[PDB]
Amino acid sequence: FDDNRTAESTDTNTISRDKNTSETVSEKTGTKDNTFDS
Amino acid sequence: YGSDMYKYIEQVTDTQSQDLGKAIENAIEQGQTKDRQQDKGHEEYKDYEDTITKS
Numbered sequence A: 001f002d003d004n005r006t007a008e009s010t011d012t013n014t015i016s017r018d019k020n021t022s023e024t025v026s027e028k029t030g031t032k033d034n035t036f037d038s
Numbered sequence B: 001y002g003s004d005m006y007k008y009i010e011q012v013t014d015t016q017s018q019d020l021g022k023a024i025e026n027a028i029e030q031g032q033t034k035d036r037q038q039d040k041g042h043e044e045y046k047d048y049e050d051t052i053t054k055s
Helices: B005-009
Strands: A002-006 A014-018 A023-037 B040-054
Antiparallel strands (some): A002 A014, A023 B040
């Protein structure tokens, strides 16, 4: 959540709002095999 | 006569000895060693990862 309020005087008041929401999901699987012979 | 008579009076046995030893020992040792190693390796792998995002 972020809000900003700007105003100037010598009267052109400016107000802004914005919504940032995000989610990420990730599933990682692996498999490693090895054989040795001495 | 004299003192020596006492030696005969009481049976006296004088015993001596002497052992003189010598010994030399000589040892020679030789050794050889031979080794041989042979190895093999092999590894394989697989991965999967799926990421889904919403904003």
